[PDB]
Amino acid sequence: NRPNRLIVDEAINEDNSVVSLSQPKMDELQLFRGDTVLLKGKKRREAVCIVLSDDTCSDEKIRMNRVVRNNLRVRLGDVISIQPCPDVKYGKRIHVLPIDDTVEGITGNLFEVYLKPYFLEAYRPIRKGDIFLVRGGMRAVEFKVVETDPSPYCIVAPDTVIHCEGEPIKREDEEESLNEVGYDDIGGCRKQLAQIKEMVELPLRHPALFKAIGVKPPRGILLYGPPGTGKTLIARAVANETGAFFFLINGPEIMSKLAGESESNLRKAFEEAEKNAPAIIFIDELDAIAPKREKTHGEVERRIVSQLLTLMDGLKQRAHVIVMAATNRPNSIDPALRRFGRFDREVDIGIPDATGRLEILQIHTKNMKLADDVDLEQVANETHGHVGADLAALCSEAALQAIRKKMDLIDLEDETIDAEVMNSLAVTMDDFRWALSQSNPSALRETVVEVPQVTWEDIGGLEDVKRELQELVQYPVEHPDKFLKFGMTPSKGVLFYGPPGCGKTLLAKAIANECQANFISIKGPELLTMWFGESEANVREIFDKARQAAPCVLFFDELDSIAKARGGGAADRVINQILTEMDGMSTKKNVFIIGATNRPDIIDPAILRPGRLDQLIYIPLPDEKSRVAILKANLRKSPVAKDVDLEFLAKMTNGFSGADLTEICQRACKLAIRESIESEIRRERERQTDDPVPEIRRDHFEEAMRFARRSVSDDDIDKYEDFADTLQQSRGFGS
Amino acid sequence: GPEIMSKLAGESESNLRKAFEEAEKNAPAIIFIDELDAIAPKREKTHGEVERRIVSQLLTLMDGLKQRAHVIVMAATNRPNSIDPALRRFGRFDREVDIGIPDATGRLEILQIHTKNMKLADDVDLEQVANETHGHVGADLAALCSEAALQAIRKKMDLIDLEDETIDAEVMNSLAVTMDDFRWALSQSNPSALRETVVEVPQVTWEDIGGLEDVKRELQELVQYPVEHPDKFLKFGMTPSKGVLFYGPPGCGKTLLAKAIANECQANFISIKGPELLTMWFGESEANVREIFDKARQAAPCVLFFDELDSIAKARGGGAADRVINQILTEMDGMSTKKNVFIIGATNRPDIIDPAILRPGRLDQLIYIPLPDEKSRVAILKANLRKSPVAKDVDLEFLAKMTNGFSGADLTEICQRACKLAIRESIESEIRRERERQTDDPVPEIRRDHFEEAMRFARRSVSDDDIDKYEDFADTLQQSRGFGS
Ligand SMILES: Nc1ncnc2c1ncn2[C@@H]1O[C@H](COP(=O)(O)OP(=O)(O)OP(O)(O)=S)[C@@H](O)[C@H]1O
Ligand SMILES: Nc1ncnc2c1ncn2[C@@H]1O[C@H](COP(=O)(O)OP(=O)(O)OP(O)(O)=S)[C@@H](O)[C@H]1O
Ligand SMILES: Nc1ncnc2c1ncn2[C@@H]1O[C@H](COP(=O)(O)OP(=O)(O)OP(O)(O)=S)[C@@H](O)[C@H]1O
Ligand SMILES: [Mg+2]
Ligand SMILES: [Mg+2]
Ligand SMILES: [Mg+2]
């Protein structure tokens, strides 16, 4: 039917009165950016909005904020009709009232703090019956438009009168709160959130459709990841955005009950959910109820486990119910639960990446007034090893710091703290740097999986090797069809070998960056850390996380460290298992394995077998051209004098490794800083009785050159040159 | 199981009691105990008095079938070893059925069952999918089909835009499942049983292996004849040797040969690489090794292949590798000649293989597999490039002459490497047309120029020193049981 009908989608402009279409659709229904559009949703409600163009928006979809989304009584995936509305006229009076539960903690002049800057210069199209949201004074309050003089909808011009008559109204039964959790409250893990969204939309959102079809949906989705990553958060969001009934099972609470009551509460939970289908039963801290079969020693505890198992099987009802569960330790869960027909789907909600943490930070600073000096992206880059909860907490603590120092002044009369005072409250970048020092990040020891920021431009020379890496890794990803036509499947892995400090580690990260694929680094020593017993299970989890992160490059660095320890029964079991995991790794899975070693003489020939690390790429010391590129790359970030001759520098340093060059750069720079520090003191002495000299000069290099030493001896090189010729012969007898 | 064990103490014993009474009542009957290990695990694992009672309770009812009212008791479990052996006694659960993981052909069958009701697109080729979904189990396939179906629905949400909870076979029947919808569900697949040892007939034939013709026939002597012609061996009064040992330089087709001979006899095949065996814990290893020989018995006639034995020999000087090999030695002797179970070993290092393996009755058939002659090298190069679109210009006899000393694997390297230039060229040619367009003619063929670069960059895997020793060992391998030097 008609073109005006459109599908609801996530928002990009967090602004309430803004909806977005594609320019091809904005042309189709003949609307432009300024236009005010009228939206008709379900439950016979209307909302009016400013339309805009959005390059990301698919033409059959309409991006609307969750505020708009609620006013229509609509959710993601539903259909709404959009139509131009030039008939909108400026208001005389608008009468908005707050909702009690969103203000009962806060006092002051609601009209002057929130409505004022919200409508000022905003020209917001509003509608009678709409509920809009204003964030400020570290609080978010929602007002409902009770009346407009040009009803039902009017624009809010500066001329318009806006009144609030004191006492707030209660929430209507149908009016979902915006204080509630949503997808816009979760960041940095889109990919996982997508999979969860996929599995659950079809059965929950369209229940009759799935009962009629007779094909099986997922019923048990298991969320796992480190603590505080937002597992409990996600479950609530999915339930609210789909509008499904949400029944919470808090692990500890169930297991805190008597024997009989525990099994009972489980039964009641499932029964009530089947009753109010569609629903999500969420089991938080599952390992509390159902740990490994051995550790469950204590018989009543085993009864509860089986009880749960019967209830999960009890989804024979298939009343449109999904059971979600969260756990810190996937390994702790009774494997009986991860059986088919129960918790069959697993989502790794990992630690957030750099961009992710930034996103998180933005969500928990929404309501706070931040000073201009605050650069959350900087905070984001510094907060490595931080998890969602760490960030949410540090944001809270940075706020409480800003509160305390600003309450030193208010303390002269602590009785009257107002919202007006709260909006005046600014949060300095210092308040954040403060919270950083006070932060106790949990996930520093967690294995990180993200796309590296080392690019080709950080690596000097080896240009043709970069291209061979593009052949081996990038082409089979971006051009699978092409490999199919030639009838060849690509090699699984590569082995870097060469003298120390030539860029083997950089290359592994480099090719990853080019392919925009995830990266996993595993150093030799890291593998010898695992207890004798633990090692077997930990290796398997590594290859599993590589699958999760496909397309992914798995890099085993510093293999020399392991090779030493074997010729040692511990290190041996590890590698044999790594070998086994490679073979189990299907080539089709888009998981690429790279090895690196400074010791090609002792590497296990079994690794070099066809199908494993069969691509033997030798990485030698840099020649004269490369040495220039290396020195340039490292010193990009450094303020260098035009005096410095690097090509002359290159010839002098023949025999030096890539690392040996960064050695000279750092050594020369430390003199430059040494000079900068001793000069500030001299300037200090001169004032006691403005033109600093921050730039590195020729003698600094000439001094560093004077003390520079070589990491790779000549005898070592001559052997390395030989191994470049005979490495592939090691599968026979020892060369 | 879980339902029983979720109930009160008394109710559990009662329900077990009630269950048997009902079966004898309405005989003939089947009592099905699903997830048996839930009720009766190994007695040590069952600390807690009532849990042991239920086991004993169950055991008595099983003894209680002395009634012989025509009642059969069936039971299912994930972990056979977890069951209290007291149940596996005669007069109780006396018959056991190994429902293994499906093989290639099996998976194909399964897929067909779960595509029964779906309108499958014309492009869909399940046999490819069957071959692609290795390590998948019946339920994995059941899900994959289910997920591929929901993908086809997922793609057709323009139709769902109706959003009305309305059924309409008209649109529903039009709904097809493309091969892409399978490939999507394939990438999203969570295969469980990849770690399981697979038992099937290999798809590698003689024709996939170039040369080594006389070795193929000796495998027919050793394997096929005692299978296809037991009577001849019987009248002549000799029973044949149990197993074979392949030894030679790396990449000559030892892994392929084992699978090839399996294919010819249409007999089951079990591959176990060295590293795979060293992964098992000291303790765990002992039961899994027995498990291998048992599944070999299950699948008789079967060829049991232990690959990359060099990896194990290396590791013993290791308390694991010592027990592993020593236990395998014991299992071979326990292998009765009558069982039609043939054991083949492979190693790239005959210098370090344990002499005990070479004793009569074990791997006493010492087959040396050397570098491929010119004849073989041509056949190999064709074999590898069958599946690829090659130019008529390409001279394989020329490549064969260039590659004297090269192993069979060294030839596939050249074939694959020549292809690597061709693909980058194919991509780099399309980019060139795209930049010219910005201001049906591509070349779907691998060419001599690609081969000429790959030949120039080609490498030899086997050194002369390596070859000369392999040649010496070919005559003196059987002497390693005495004093070795
Ligand atoms: N990805 C995220 N985006 C936004 N906020 C997050 C995110 N992850 C965690 N948080 C915050 O962390 C806090 C705790 O979230 P929870 O869901 O309870 O953590 P969790 O994953 O359930 O960890 P538990 O309690 O050990 S299972 C919430 O207040 C969130 O705001
Ligand atoms: N090609 C290069 N370009 C720029 N810097 C390099 C290059 N090669 C080595 N380096 C420097 O040496 C450091 C470490 O190099 P790696 O990537 O780790 O090489 P490697 O072969 O793994 O040697 P090691 O033993 O790990 S240092 C880097 O941090 C660089 O500063
Ligand atoms: N006679 C041959 N015919 C066809 N391909 C061969 C032949 N010999 C070696 N190859 C190739 O080399 C690869 C590996 O050979 P294998 O069957 O594994 O023998 P191998 O003795 O076990 O050598 P390795 O150490 O396992 S590579 C195969 O995938 C083939 O592509
Ligand atoms: Mg929680
Ligand atoms: Mg390094
Ligand atoms: Mg092999």
Swiss-Prot record, chain A:
What name does UniProt use for this protein? Answer: Transitional endoplasmic reticulum ATPase
Result, substituting residue 367 to H: In IBMPFD1; uncertain significance
**UniProt xrefs under SUPFAM superfamilies:** ADC-like, Cdc48 domain 2-like, P-loop containing nucleoside triphosphate hydrolases
InterPro entries assigned? AAA+_ATPase, AAA_ATPase_CDC48, AAA_ATPase_domain, AAA_lid_3, Asp_de-COase-like_dom_sf, ATPase_AAA_core, ATPase_AAA_CS, Cdc48_dom2
**Keywords assigned by UniProt, alphabetized:** Acetylation, Amyotrophic lateral sclerosis, ATP-binding, Autophagy, Charcot-Marie-Tooth disease, Cytoplasm, Disease variant, DNA damage, DNA repair, Endoplasmic reticulum, Hydrolase, Isopeptide bond, Lipid-binding, Methylation, Neurodegeneration, Neuropathy, Nucleotide-binding, Nucleus, Phosphoprotein, Transport, Ubl conjugation, Ubl conjugation pathway
Q: Which reaction does it catalyse?
A: ATP + H2O = ADP + phosphate + H(+)
Q: Name one GO cellular component term.
A: extracellular exosome
The reported result of mutating residue 296 to A is: Does not affect methylation by VCPKMT
PTM annotation (N6-acetyllysine): residues: 482, 485, 642, 719
- Which disorder is it associated with? Inclusion body myopathy with early-onset Paget disease with or without frontotemporal dementia 1: An autosomal dominant disease characterized by disabling muscle weakness clinically resembling to limb girdle muscular dystrophy, osteolytic bone lesions consistent with Paget disease, and premature frontotemporal dementia. Clinical features show incomplete penetrance.
Quick one: effect of changing residue 349 to T?
Answer: In IBMPFD1; uncertain significance
Phosphothreonine: which positions carry it? 416
Consequence of mutating residue 135 to H?
In FTDALS6 and IBMPFD1; properly assembles into a hexameric structure; cultured cells expressing the mutant protein show a marked general increase in the level of ubiquitin-conjugated proteins and impaired protein degradation through the endoplasmic reticulum-associated degradation (ERAD) pathway; shows strongly reduced affinity for ADP and increased affinity for ATP; shows normal ATPase activity according to PubMed:16321991 while according to PubMed:25878907 and PubMed:25125609 shows increased ATPase activity; no defect in ubiquitin-dependent protein degradation by the proteasome; impaired autophagic function; defective maturation of ubiquitin-containing autophagosomes; decreased interaction with CAV1 and UBXN6; decreased endosome to lysosome transport via multivesicular body sorting pathway of CAV1; decreases the arsenite-induced stress granules (SGs) clearance process
Q: Which residues carry this modification: N6,N6,N6-trimethyllysine?
A: 295
**Mutating residue 234 to F has which effect?**
In IBMPFD1; uncertain significance
